[model samples]
Target: GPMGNGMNKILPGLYIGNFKDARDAEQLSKNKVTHILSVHDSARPMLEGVKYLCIPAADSPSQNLTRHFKESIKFIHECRLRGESCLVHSLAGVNRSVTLVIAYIMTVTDFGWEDALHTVRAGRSCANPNVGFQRQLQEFEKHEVHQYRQWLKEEY
Candidate 1:
């Protein structure tokens, strides 16, 4: 159970669910998810009572993806620093969400890809179900540190 699946105790304060409906979002909010990060455009209206932010990213190249990724990371990091528990979700809770989560893990933890992927999969079986998304992560991992710095400059 990861922080988006039905299992709420994945990381002491995180929860996880395949919620694409308003009812599920309401339930999660009732259960105390202070912030909802919707990575899918269609599900934006589902959230209520929770502070909602839309940062949509799909599996393919889109003009909005890079900017959204950077902004969402910045927001998520800010929320975490302020002690708010955030829930991040995509359409299927797979590709897009997993990519963002992986990026967050990379940014915050000492864990490498192997450890991060293993940790995520241990909680949610279908965490990164898309092969293309996995490849994208591999590419991201191969990126030079300076490349990340460049992306940050362009993105921010």
Candidate 2:
């Protein structure tokens, strides 16, 4: 398949998958994915009774995913806090969605970029951020993640 097979659980309430999985009723109900963070071209709300955080972005190396990391983290974390499931997905469930999920993992835990990426890969084998996204995650590990952790502590 061009898109991956199915959604993979990265954490208790956090999942990642392709756009097709995102829109699939069987997958959504099976996983109980009530909140969807869609990051890709034509990202928007679709199904009823499902919360959405749409980030319109490209899969290109130059696309600035760092800007959306905060909101994406907040969306995913909030859903988890409420004991609800969140599905983060891009076109292929490879780059953009995985990048944001890695950022979320880094913020919530003490892991750095590479370790956070490893955690994501442990759950979703196809997970891979683009080179530019990797660089951004590296920069985040070097500098911003500390503040992000602090912000998470203060906010939640």
Candidate 3:
């Protein structure tokens, strides 16, 4: 499992990996990762047996974090619903990737912020290492989950 440092078995079918590049993604695919979810703007090299999804990073302030959070959750839900294991990553696999993965864990499971953060830190010591990203997560939490869900419904 090229899942990096803080990769943990969240449950039976869910495993979260820290930041990964195309090469790391390739290794994960070989390890039976069915999908690669990229939170960065980089082009993903075609892997032999993996589905690749690239959602460009949403900028802060102008683009609401809740919107990005919703999109991320929707993508993760789509993959999991199809019974595919997904590997999500950003540039460093610390801030952006970690934030989105934490969002997914919060949205899809019973995991809260504390639990999610703990799980992520257990794998990648540098998960959400940036203070800015941490603030973004905090801001998103200040808003109601239904607000995000409604935003998703209205926008898409």
Candidate 4:
């Protein structure tokens, strides 16, 4: 689904792309990806010194990605917030990794599902999470929309 290049800058310090795109240590270093979240389990070792957090899940709709959402998102956010650039990837950089990134975007920001998806697409045009992952993201959006609104309301 990553219709653009092998990888794209999804956010300030977050990147989404494929395996071939990340196999190059010089390239990864050039982009300054200090951490990596590999959702497909088959991902290669991070570029020598790059940190890694892999989720052992398949690229199928049946996989329960929600179970790992919190931990995965935490890792992504932690790395990025710590002034470390992070990369999220799968085999194709389309399904599983995209799904997790979408959930992370929605949960951490006020963007709805569609808006968040568009945001990812801006960086990596090939991003297309599966039906199952989309459903899970809907649930994540459902839960987070209220939390964000409530928190903002209380803050006012």
Candidate 5:
């Protein structure tokens, strides 16, 4: 309950978890995780072989997470396209990490922010973006998601 089911798989090549799950060698190996998207204040590369896209961010309600959504989506999409798995994790895996994953899901599919967030919750019960992050997602769904979807199609 505390660790929240250790790197819960959300999609075929995507997982969401806490910082400890990021460092867990056994979990990484079992999940076939080759890429790690670490989003947190001290995010950095910890292991040797694992590829990392570290976004040094905070989980605060006021932090600007919306800006990083595009790059994070790109990184995860590339890893999955290569048939590799990716683990997206923040300090607790409940807020900041979940927000980015929701953004990625929204971009790749026809789902809006609420649907994307629901999908994440289905996979990882602890998936809950903060209030400000929720507002950002709402804004993304209302304003920027169409552009992001078109951009994704054009880019990939």
Candidate 6:
């Protein structure tokens, strides 16, 4: 959705794209999209060898997106660790999808806020998170990694 009608492979097995990319079986098969994370809403995929989960959310700066960040991050991380790919998508692949992926990268890679954002932008120009979401990302940078580690122990 970033200038093209195709999904962007932000990392080796991680994709931040829209619904159009999710439904494109040829491309999904070609890219081997084995797992998918729908940030908000539901969409049926026309393919085999794919798993899906939806964390219903809204596109608002006031949405308490932090609550779902850990699960989203863990799912994508597990998919990559298993040597599979995942498509994290919202309506336009701009706000929520991009935000979650950035948090995942930041959490797993330990990249700071700007570093992670820039890394994604290198692959996706439309990776801007909303104001409150951006605040969460910045706050995430301030949050200790141990906090996430503890969350892993409790519920990952």
Q: Which of the two candidates, 1 or 2, achieves a greater lDDT against the reference?
A: 2
lDDT per residue, candidate 2, 27-52, as tens digits?
89999989999999999999997999
Answer with 2 or 3, whichever has the higher TM-score.
2
Q: Which digits, one per residue and each the tens of the lDDT, describe model 3 over residues 60-155?
A: 434334457776777766777777677777666665677777777666545565677777777666665356566666766666554665655564
Candidate 5's TM-score:
0.97
How would the candidate models be sorted by lDDT, starting from the highest? 5, 2, 6, 4, 3, 1
TM-score, one value per model: 0.71, 0.97, 0.70, 0.86, 0.97, 0.86
- Least well predicted 10-residue stretch by lDDT in candidate 6: 39-48
**Candidate 2, TM-score vs. the true structure?**
0.97
- Local accuracy of candidate 6 as per-residue lDDT tens digits, 8-120: 88999998788777778888888989988887655444456788867777887567777787778788878887899999888888888888888877776658768888988
Q: Cα-based RMSD of the predictions, in order?
A: 4.6, 1.0, 4.6, 3.4, 0.9, 2.7
Each candidate: how many clashes? 7, 0, 5, 3, 0, 0
Is 3 or 4 the stronger prediction by TM-score? 4
lDDT on C-alpha atoms for all candidate structures? 0.58, 0.92, 0.61, 0.78, 0.93, 0.79
lDDT of 1: 0.58
Model 3, clash count?
5
Query: Candidate 5: minimum summed lDDT over ten consecutive residues — where?
Result: 1-10
| Model 3 ranges with Cα > 4 A deviation | 1-21, 24-26, 41-45, 58-65, 146-156
Report the lDDT tens digits of candidate 5 across residue range 76-147.
999999999999999888998999999999999999988998999899998888899999999999999999
Per-residue alpha-carbon lDDT of candidate 4 for residues 114-136, written as tens digits (9 for 90 to 100): 88899998878878888888888
Distance from true location, Cα of 43 in model 1, Å: 4.4
- Model 3 RMSD in Å is 4.6
Better of 1 and 3 by lDDT: 3
Off by over 4 Å in 5: none
